[PDB]
Structure formats: structure tokens, C-alpha cells
């Protein structure tokens, strides 16, 4: 599916990190859009995998549903 999250992302160091977690998973193509602080993820990860790997940037992250 295409999940869309929200992603407290401040700046493009920030916006690159999630990059990095999201391809360290691997199996997500993904969207990051840094001024609407939101992240679109194509995948067949879990929400749940989903959203505990883009919380181990430490930044507060929710899911907002499906886009899709």
C-alpha cells in the first residue's frame, strides 16, 4: 500500500535521515516532502514496521492513513 505519515522533519539533515532509515528497511519506494513535514511510503512493510522505523530517527513521527 501507500501509507502517508507525518514526520516532525526541521531541516534537510533531518529530511536525509529519514531517507537513510527508510533504505536501510529496504522493500518502500518513498516521498519525503520537508516543508509539509509528510512522508509517502509505498510498501508491503507493516504500518507498524513502518512507523517504528521511521521513529528511530528519534523525531516524532504518526500515521495519517492511506493516500493511495
Known sequence: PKH???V?????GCAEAVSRVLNKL???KYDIDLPNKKV???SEH???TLLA???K?????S???LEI
Open 53 to 55: 522505523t521511521l521513529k
Open 4 to 6: 502517508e505519515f507525518s
Open 40 to 42: 509517502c511510503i509505498e
Open 57 to 61: 530517527t528519534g523525531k516524532t513521527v
Open 63 to 65: 500515521y495519517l492513513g
Open 46 to 48: 507493516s504500518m507498524d
Open 26 to 28: 529496504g522493500g518502500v
Open 8 to 12: 516532525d522533519m526541521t531541516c534537510g
